[PDB]
């Protein structure tokens, strides 16, 4: 039995990585350093989207919607043609299909998805609700479908609803939701009401300055956020407001002092390709300077826009010397660039409450391995030369009821990573994108900066189920 950190502190390794060769730690801000509290933050976002939808003309019944965190799972696929929330596997196959709040079973899925299959490439048809900000709109969409479906004033249709002489399609409707969320995030009052009560909305943890401290003793540390500087200063100042610096008794110091480079208005994902013009920010006003200091790496400066390359020049680093910590899954379309890629630490908040299910619901996992063992015993001496057709309909039904019992410990749309046997599309892009992942980057605090992160083998069927311990010539 090999030693492993306690489960809640671990950094999970998809591809091996020698920490010693890391010269730079980069940081996302939103949902990486600034972990927005849950359900509270989603409920805020949700409410501001409903109100904005009502002001543009939506029916007042929407004001009755209250966000329910137990419904959405991140990563779902909205089908703007059929108004369905879909949980797909890595290869496009349906796992969960719910219309509004109505969960469709296998046989009925074949009416609209005759081969239980969607074409995820059809960017026109489907929208992947991949991001922690997409959480409220995921519930909102089910709500609106559930509402209009059950409200007498409207007639339900394959692709939407009839409202007298009018027709709101699930696709027209989805765009309203999408635009409203954009409006809430940009011209709206989300960042306003967030800053006006940070205790309510943003987690504060005092190990965060400690961790960034030791990072800077052994490497360079930078920040590259998409939010403007006025919003960053407010959120970063609160994350560092303690009556002491990194360790207690020591003097507090500004948050800018924990970074060798600070960049705002990055404009990710375009940041990683050509970029934008590299600007510098007057920190007094939070407004761009007209000129821009170009030269060596001196501090006090806050850069705006730019590109991933620009960061690499200023820090004096090759790509693979940069570990980049964040909450987003940047597509494999930037990996193509002949530039050296950044290493990756992906933050997946869900991980915490799912590692809980995994350790506290062990009774259900055991009941599954029992029926599985028992089922293999009923066939132990059966082959193609066997008449016998055992009765396994009730034990097949029990396996059906216990995985669903297990599926529901995660939420109404199940685990983020799997549904029963199959891995979800989301876990597929986690494995493709992320060298390292965990629930918070703060888990880096429990590993020496000399650590060797040796990845685990993702075993194939013939690899997990046969141990290392005359043949037909067809083999």
Reported residue count of the chain is 475
By a kind-dependent CB cut-off of 5 to 8 A, residue 470 interacts, out of its own copies, Mg ion, none, with: none
**Interface pattern 351-370 for its own copies (x via CB under 8 A):** xxx-x--xx-xx--xx--x-
Q: To the nearest whole angstrom, how small is the minimum distance from the Cβ of residue 27 to its own copies?
A: 13
By a kind-dependent CB cut-off of 5 to 8 A, residue 15 interacts, out of Mg ion, its own copies, none, with: its own copies
Site for its own copies in 315-354 (CB under 8 A): 319, 332, 335-341, 349, 351-353
How far apart CA 462 and CA 472 sit, in angstroms, is 19
Stretch that binds its own copies, among 9-17, 21-29, 250-258, 308-316 (CB under 8 A): 9-17
Residue 23 in 3-state DSSP?
Answer: coil
For strands 102-104 and 94-99, give the pairing: antiparallel
The yes or no reply on residue 31 touching Mg ion (CB under 5 A) is yes
By a kind-dependent CB cut-off of 5 to 8 A, residue 299 interacts, out of its own copies, Mg ion, none, with: none
With tokens 């797909």, the residue in question is 88
What is the 3 state secondary structure string of 95-157?
Answer: EEEEECCEEECHHHHHHHCCCCECCCCCCCCEEEECCCCHHHHHHHHHHHHHHHHHCCCCEEC
CB 457 within 8 A of CB 463: yes
> Of the two residues 250 and 362, which places its CB atom closer to its own copies in the complex?
362
How far apart CA 245 and CA 213 sit, in angstroms, is 9
With tokens 């806050």, the residue in question is 302
Q: At a CB cut-off of 8 Å and minimum separation 6, what does 98 contact?
A: 84, 85, 104, 142, 413
CA angle 466–472–473, rounded 5-degree value: 110
How far apart CA 257 and CA 274 sit, in angstroms, is 29
> Of the two residues 30 and 137, which places its CB atom closer to Mg ion in the complex?
30
Binding-site member from 63, 151, 382, 408 for its own copies (CB under 8 A): 382
Q: Quick one: tokens of 224?
A: 């590259």
Binding-site member from 277, 316, 400, 404 for its own copies (CB under 8 A): 277
Stretch that binds Mg ion, among 28-36, 159-167, 406-414, 452-460 (CB under 5 A): 28-36
The yes or no reply on residue 28 touching Mg ion (CB under 5 A) is yes
**Other residues' Cβ atoms within 10 Å of the Cβ of residue 72:** 24
Site for its own copies in 80-109 (CB under 8 A): 90-92
By a kind-dependent CB cut-off of 5 to 8 A, residue 288 interacts, out of its own copies, Mg ion, none, with: its own copies
By a kind-dependent CB cut-off of 5 to 8 A, residue 56 interacts, out of its own copies, Mg ion, none, with: its own copies
Name the closest residue to Mg ion (Cβ). 30
The yes or no reply on residue 432 touching its own copies (CB under 8 A) is yes
**Number of residues lying near its own copies (CB under 8 A):** 152
Minimal CA–CA distance to 145: which of 131, 134, 163, 159?
159
The yes or no reply on residue 372 touching its own copies (CB under 8 A) is yes
By a kind-dependent CB cut-off of 5 to 8 A, residue 28 interacts, out of its own copies, Mg ion, none, with: Mg ion
> Of the two residues 96 and 266, which places its CB atom closer to Mg ion in the complex?
266
**Other residues' Cβ atoms within 10 Å of the Cβ of residue 285:** 10
> Of the two residues 195 and 218, which places its CB atom closer to Mg ion in the complex?
195
Site for Mg ion in 325-384 (CB under 5 A): 327
Minimal CA–CA distance to 77: which of 33, 30, 113?
113
> Of the two residues 152 and 461, which places its CB atom closer to its own copies in the complex?
461
Binding-site member from 392, 398, 402, 405 for its own copies (CB under 8 A): 392
Minimal CA–CA distance to 311: which of 373, 349, 266?
266
By a kind-dependent CB cut-off of 5 to 8 A, residue 242 interacts, out of its own copies, Mg ion, none, with: none
> Of the two residues 30 and 350, which places its CB atom closer to Mg ion in the complex?
30
By a kind-dependent CB cut-off of 5 to 8 A, residue 327 interacts, out of its own copies, Mg ion, none, with: Mg ion
The yes or no reply on residue 149 touching its own copies (CB under 8 A) is no
With tokens 């940081």, the residue in question is 27
Binding-site member from 30, 42, 137, 233 for Mg ion (CB under 5 A): 30
Task: Please give the distance of CA 398 from its chain centroid, rounded to a whole number.
Answer: 32
> Of the two residues 218 and 257, which places its CB atom closer to its own copies in the complex?
218
Site for its own copies in 43-82 (CB under 8 A): 56-58
Per DSSP, which regions of 343-440 are E strands? 343-347, 418-419, 422-423, 436-438
> Of the two residues 39 and 102, which places its CB atom closer to its own copies in the complex?
39
Maximal C-alpha separation, the chain: 85
Angle between helices 40-55 and 170-185 (to 10 degrees): 120
Which residues of this chain interact with Mg ion, rule CB under 5 A? 28, 30-31, 327
């Amino acid at each position: 039995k090999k030693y492993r950190r306690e489960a809640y502190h671990r950094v999970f390794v998809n591809r091996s990585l020698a920490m010693e060769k890391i010269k730079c730690f980069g940081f996302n801000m939103d949902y990486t350093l600034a972990v927005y509290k849950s359900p509270e933050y989603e409920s805020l976002g949700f409410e501001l989207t409903v109100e904005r939808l009502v002001s543009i003309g939506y029916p007042q019944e929407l004001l009755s919607f209250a966000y329910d965190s137990t419904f959405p799972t991140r990563g779902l696929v909205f089908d703007t043609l059929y108004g369905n929330l879909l949980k797909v596997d890595a290869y496009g196959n349906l796992l969960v299909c719910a219309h509004g709040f109505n969960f469709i079973r296998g046989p009925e899925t074949r009416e609209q998805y005759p081969n239980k299959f969607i074409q995820r490439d059809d960017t026109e048809r489907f929208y992947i609700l991949n991001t922690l900000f997409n959480l409220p709109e995921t519930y909102l969409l089910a709500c609106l479908v559930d509402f209009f479906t059950n409200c007498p004033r409207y007639t339900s249709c394959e692709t939407g609803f009839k409202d007298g002489d009018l027709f709101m399609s699930y696709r027209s409707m989805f765009q309203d939701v999408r635009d409203a969320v954009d409006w809430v995030h940009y011209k709206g009052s989300l960042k306003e009401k967030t800053v006006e009560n940070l205790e309510k909305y943003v987690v504060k943890d005092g190990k965060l300055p400690l961790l960034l401290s030791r990072m800077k003793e052994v490497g360079k540390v930078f920040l590259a956020t998409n939010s403007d500087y006025k919003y960053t200063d407010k959120i970063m100042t609160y994350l560092f407001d303690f009556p002491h610096g990194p360790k207690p008794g020591s003097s507090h110091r500004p948050w800018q002092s924990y970074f060798d480079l600070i960049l705002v208005d990055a404009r990710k994902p375009l940041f990683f390709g050509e970029g934008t013009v590299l600007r510098q920010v007057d920190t007094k006003t939070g407004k761009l300077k007209i000129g821009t200091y170009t030269g060596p790496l001196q501090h006090g400066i806050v850069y705006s826009g730019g590109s991933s390359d620009t960061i690499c020049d200023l820090l004096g680093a090759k790509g693979k010397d940069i570990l980049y910590i964040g909450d987003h899954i940047f597509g494999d379309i930037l990996k193509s660039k002949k530039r050296q890629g950044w290493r990756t630490f992906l933050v997946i908040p869900e991980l915490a409450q799912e590692l809980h299910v995994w350790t506290d619901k062990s009774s259900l996992f055991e009941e599954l391995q029992s029926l599985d063992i028992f089922l293999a015993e009923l066939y132990k001496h059966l082959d193609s030369s066997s008449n016998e057709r055992p009765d396994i309909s009730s034990i097949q039904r029990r396996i059906k009821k216990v995985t669903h019992d297990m599926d529901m410990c995660y939420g109404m749309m199940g685990s983020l990573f799997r549904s029963g046997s199959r891995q979800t599309l989301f876990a597929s892009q986690v494995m493709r994108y992320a060298d390292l992942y965990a629930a918070s980057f703060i888990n880096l605090l429990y590993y020496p900066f000399s650590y060797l992160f040796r990845a685990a083998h993702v075993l194939m069927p013939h690899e997990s189920t046969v141990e290392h311990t005359m043949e037909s010539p067809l083999a």
